[PDB]
Design a protein around this ligand. Structure first.
Ligand SMILES: O=C(O)c1cc(-c2cn[nH]c2)ccc1Oc1ccccc1
Ligand SMILES: O=C(O)c1cc(-c2cn[nH]c2)ccc1Oc1ccccc1
Lengths: 114, 114, 114
């Protein structure tokens, strides 16, 4: 999968090791090999949630297959938990958008998937 | 609703309270509870529109329902106007990608909206 | 179309005129009018690909209508070729997500397309 986090929480508060932990945990959760997992964190952002500048996060999980009701709930729980634990962002100020990418619509290594 | 603005307009040009303004106008325009309205502004971007460096913006508005023909026309007029008045970006150098997210694909507060 | 590059390659490693080259090349590959081609490059990002933080890119290319595997493979090679040659990014560490936007869900110039 591809996972992206945008947040108003500053650079300093992003623990070293956090990108690795997202890669590890996302492999463990999705049933996907970690070699192709991409993770992206953007701190120091001018954003708001409900109008308020209290810590928040706008996130994105792109996957080729394996997206739906029950799975997206378990990923939400895992990643909210991780953002709360590591960046002190409350779960109710996190949004995670899930996308099921069709294989031909994902470019990689001078071509596309499958 | 989630609204994101990326622009080559510098940090200094974004007026104080712009995020709240976007949150008020989006709450009106969509009829949605204000607590669910997220906004994000990214200034100083290395962007071009038509190959030119002139002020421009690339935006997106994600929502669970309330996305379609007339609504999007109206959102575009509202939002381009706000970007013209506040950021001094000509409407013809603005894109806003609209997305109608299914409830099961939007994570929040340790779960999804399903 | 709209092309967006996010990378951990620094600001300085991005050559001058790279946005015009991307605009040039996208116009000649796709046949689309250059005036509506939007490009966005975001250097110095905190990201990892396959657990590792060697130079990488997570990209997107949005078009109105008409997406297929033949075109996407050609765009992938073209775009991967430009990132190798100019940004020193190995093609096996580049994702490009393709999207077929409906005309009505792309806001522009106070209205939407078609
Ligand atoms: O988890 C995925 O399905 C997966 C998803 C993506 C992706 C990048 N942007 N949008 C989607 C890339 C590689 C993947 O992993 C693969 C690993 C091996 C073979 C095929 C895909
Ligand atoms: O190349 C495209 O398909 C195209 C894509 C977009 C777009 C913006 N955000 N997401 C997609 C806008 C105009 C386009 O070009 C057009 C040219 C003429 C008429 C309509 C669209």
């Amino acid at each position: 999968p591809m996972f992206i986090v945008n947040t108003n929480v500053p650079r300093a508060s992003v623990p070293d090791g956090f990108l690795s932990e997202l890669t590890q945990q996302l492999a463990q959760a999705t049933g996907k090999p970690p070699q192709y997992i991409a993770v992206h964190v953007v701190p120091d952002q001018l954003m708001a949630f409900g109008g308020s500048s209290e810590p928040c996060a706008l996130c994105s999980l792109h996957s080729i297959g394996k997206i739906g009701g029950a799975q997206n709930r378990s990923y939400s729980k895992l990643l909210c938990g991780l953002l709360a634990e590591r960046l002190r962002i409350s779960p109710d100020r996190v949004y995670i958008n899930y996308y099921d990418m069709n294989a031909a619509n994902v470019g990689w290594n001078n071509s596309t998937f499958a």
